[PDB]
């Protein structure tokens, strides 16, 4: 375990930084947990669109 104390300037400034670390922590966490990940942001659907379209011509039979 661990602990992180945030010494900031104003309450409005440090409050947003509190949930900002917890949000980014789960991002790094979830990647390093399921151990095999894949690039997101639409990179999966774009690559499958090109490969499966060339694979369609090698089959036939409707």
């Amino acid at each position: 375990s661990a602990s992180i104390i945030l010494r900031g300037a104003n309450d409005f400034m440090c409050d947003e930084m509190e949930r900002s670390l917890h949000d980014a922590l789960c991002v790094v966490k979830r990647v390093l947990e399921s151990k095999s990940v894949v690039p997101g942001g639409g990179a999966v659907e774009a690559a499958l669109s090109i490969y499966l379209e060339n694979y369609a011509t090698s089959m036939g039979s409707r």
Binding site: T57, G60, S61, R62
Partner: peptide, 13 residues
């Protein structure tokens, strides 16, 4: 038209 065009398209590949 469907069976001919589909088999023809794969043949040009």
């Amino acid at each position: 038209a469907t069976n001919i065009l589909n088999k023809l398209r794969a043949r040009h590949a």
